[PDB]
Curated annotation (Swiss-Prot), chain A:
Present with 7330 molecules/cell in log phase SD medium. The gene is AAR2. Residues 244-265 are annotated as: Leucine-zipper. It comes from the Eukaryota. Transmembrane segments: none annotated. Its main location: cytoplasm. This is A1 cistron-splicing factor AAR2. GO terms for cellular component: cytoplasm; U5 snRNP. GO terms for biological process: spliceosomal snRNP assembly; spliceosomal tri-snRNP complex assembly. Component of the U5 snRNP complex that is required for spliceosome assembly and for pre-mRNA splicing. Involved in splicing pre-mRNA of the A1 cistron and other genes that are important for cell growth. Keywords: Cytoplasm, mRNA processing, mRNA splicing, Nucleus, Phosphoprotein.
Curated annotation (Swiss-Prot), chain B:
It is found in: Nucleus. Present with 468 molecules/cell in log phase SD medium. The lineage of its organism: Eukaryota, Fungi, Dikarya, Ascomycota, Saccharomycotina. Functions as a scaffold that mediates the ordered assembly of spliceosomal proteins and snRNAs. Required for association of BRR2 with the spliceosomal U5 snRNP, and the subsequent assembly of the U4/U6-U5 tri-snRNP complex. Functions as a scaffold that positions spliceosomal U2, U5 and U6 snRNAs at splice sites on pre-mRNA substrates, so that splicing can occur. Interacts with both the 5' and the 3' splice site, as well as the branch region. Has a role in branch site-3' splice site selection. Associates with the branch site-3' splice 3'-exon region. Also has a role in cell cycle. This is Pre-mRNA-splicing factor 8. Changing residue 23 to A: Reduced growth at 30 degrees Celsius. Strongly reduced growth at 16 degrees Celsius. The MPN (JAB/Mov34) domain has structural similarity with deubiquitinating enzymes, but lacks the residues that would bind the catalytic metal ion. Contains a region with structural similarity to reverse transcriptase, presenting the classical thumb, fingers and palm architecture, but lacks enzyme activity, since the essential metal-binding residues are not conserved. Component of the U4/U6-U5 tri-snRNP complex composed of the U4, U6 and U5 snRNAs and at least PRP3, PRP4, PRP6, PRP8, PRP18, PRP31, PRP38, SNU13, SNU23, SNU66, SNU114, SPP381, SMB1, SMD1, SMD2, SMD3, SMX2, SMX3, LSM2, LSM3, LSM4, LSM5, LSM6, LSM7, LSM8, BRR2 and DIB1. Coiled coil: none annotated. Changing residue 22 to N: Reduced growth at 30 degrees Celsius. Strongly reduced growth at 16 degrees Celsius. The chain holds residues 1836 to 2069 of 2413 of the full protein. Changing residue 105 to K: Severely impaired growth. Reduced growth at 30 degrees Celsius. Strongly reduced growth at 16 degrees Celsius. It comes from the Eukaryota. Residues 7-237 are annotated as: RNase H homology domain.
């Protein structure tokens, strides 16, 4: 179990750790989050009591170093940092626990939800989508735009998701125009899986990171990427059985975990009605279809 | 964006553009089988590709053999149209390639776009206009060349004959769509009006009679009266 200490909490802010979140009052003595489960990626995020705009946060993994949070009054936000002094860091962490000023990551032991949302998410891949390689953790916020969004401004702050475009030379072999646009199997399996992503797990991992950024920051271009990656699978006639079955699990926990009030902006009606009812893989998403119908029959 | 009554006159500027009408690409008769089931028999079709500015018509004939052994033919008809339009553009010298292609039916956008991926600077546009180009097979010479064809074949025409010697493009296109609007609503009447006078002939290199200017005015009025009448009849106004 690992710890992410906070130097202080000088402004009123709602803090999230993964799917959990806590209200912290201006200069309440909050000094960190303990018992964070080793072995997965994590995200720690913020929404100031005063600006319900700009949700922001940090993807990290505690195996890659000792991280703490510190409010910056110049830049106006909670910043994630690395302590390189191992001894100086266990010292901080042990004193705040002794004083019991830290919350416990509140994991029910029956609950695989976080593991189910991050199964294929790996910190190394995240740091390629969010290039900033003097930190081992990654910043994301509400307003960051993706590489594909920018093509249609500032690249240092871009989300370098893999560009998927159904009407591009990449997607469409010449002479197979009609075939390849109606049956994207060759874009999916040769171009994206074997070509770019190399395996299904990196693809799933990007799909999943996209979702989480959409859900936790309302990053609209991540939402677009999650939908595009779902759609490319569902619109392919030939998909390894192991991907179809894993996809149905992946989507099930994403749909399950989504705040009920948010379905309207985070769920693209066309994509889901095509995937679940019109696509080649209509019949291969039995759990995702059951949960979508019982929870959001309106969208359908 | 889409083409409509507001930006109508853009059709007649000096930016090369073509209309693609796909309505007659896939044509069938519907009949009964010996066992009483229904079946279709395909007949020859045509893509109607038209430069509204100059009258040039790229009549690509679609031979029934194209369909042999194919499923989902009405869907395939759209991809074939897009394929042939793409091949046409590719065959034209650069300075003749269009800057815009306007498809009369929105279902053509995705097939055409996909087939034009090599021509990113050619804009594919829909239209809100209700153009009568399905009546192109009501022009006898066009229906004749399509129905006799024994192979794929492109036949080139000027759909305005020699009108542009005496009128503008804008007015030529208005005449053409009025004629074809009338052929569509009541072909028998429309064709009666055009040939009632045996002394007015069609040149061998033309599609329409050689009306004088004054005779065209009477024709146009007779076509307008035909179209209005048919409307009251349709709706009982």
């Amino acid at each position: 179990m690992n710890t992410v200490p906070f130097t202080s909490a000088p402004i009123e802010v709602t803090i999230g750790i993964d799917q959990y979140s806590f209200n912290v009052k201006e200069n309440q003595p909050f000094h960190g989050i303990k018992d964070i489960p080793i072995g997965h990626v994590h995200v720690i995020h913020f929404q100031h009591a005063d600006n319900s705009s700009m949700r922001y946060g940090y993807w990290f993994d505690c195996r890659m170093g000792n991280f703490y949070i510190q409010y910056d009054p110049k830049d106006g936000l909670y910043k994630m940092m690395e302590e390189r002094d191992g001894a100086k860091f266990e010292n901080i962490v042990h004193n705040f626990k002794e004083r019991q000023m830290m919350v416990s990551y509140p994991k029910i032991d029956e609950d695989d939800t976080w593991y189910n949302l991050t199964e294929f998410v790996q910190m190394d891949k995240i740091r390629k989508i969010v290039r900033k390689d003097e930190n081992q953790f990654s910043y994301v916020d509400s307003s960051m735009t993706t590489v594909q969004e920018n093509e249609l401004s500032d690249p240092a702050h871009s989300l370098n998701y893999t560009v998927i475009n159904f009407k591009s030379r990449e997607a469409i072999r010449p002479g197979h125009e009609m075939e390849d646009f109606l049956d994207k199997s060759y874009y999916l399996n040769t171009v994206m899986l074997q070509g770019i992503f190399k395996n299904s797990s990196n693809y799933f991992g990007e799909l999943q990171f996209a979702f989480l950024n959409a859900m936790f920051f309302g990053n609209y271009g991540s939402s677009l990427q999650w939908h595009a990656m779902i759609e490319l699978i569902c619109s392919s006639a030939t998909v390894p059985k192991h991907m179809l079955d894993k996809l149905d699990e992946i989507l099930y926990y994403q749909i399950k975990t989504l705040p009920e009030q948010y379905s309207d902006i985070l769920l693209n009606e066309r994509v889901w009605n095509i995937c679940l009812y019109s696509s080649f893989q209509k019949n291969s998403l039995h759990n995702t279809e059951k949960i979508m119908e019982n929870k959001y029959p309106e969208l359908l | 964006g889409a083409m409509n009554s507001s930006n109508y006159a853009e059709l007649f500027n000096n930016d090369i553009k073509l209309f693609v009408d796909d309505t007659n690409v896939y044509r069938v008769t519907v009949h009964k089988t010996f066992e009483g089931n229904v079946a279709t028999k395909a007949i020859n079709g045509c893509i109607f590709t038209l430069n509204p500015k100059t009258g040039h018509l790229f009549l690509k004939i679609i031979h029934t053999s194209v369909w042999a052994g194919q499923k989902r033919l009405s869907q395939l008809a759209k991809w074939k149209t897009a394929e042939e339009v793409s091949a046409l553009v590719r065959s034209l010298p650069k300075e003749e390639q269009p800057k815009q292609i306007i498809v009369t039916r929105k279902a053509m956008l995705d097939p055409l776009e996909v087939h034009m991926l090599d021509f990113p600077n050619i804009a594919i546009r829909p239209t809100e206009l209700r153009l009568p180009f399905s009546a192109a097979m009501s022009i006898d010479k066009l229906s004749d060349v399509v129905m006799k064809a024994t192979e794929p074949q492109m036949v080139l025409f000027n759909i305005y004959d020699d009108w542009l010697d005496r009128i503008s493009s804008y007015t030529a296109f208005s005449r053409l769509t009025l004629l074809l609007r009338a052929l569509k609503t009541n072909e028998e009447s429309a064709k009666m009006i055009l040939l009632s006078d045996p002394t007015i002939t069609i040149k061998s290199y033309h599609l329409w009679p050689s009306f004088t200017d004054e005779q065209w005015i009477t024709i146009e009025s007779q076509m307008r009266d035909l179209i209005l009448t048919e409307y009251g009849r349709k709706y009982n106004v």
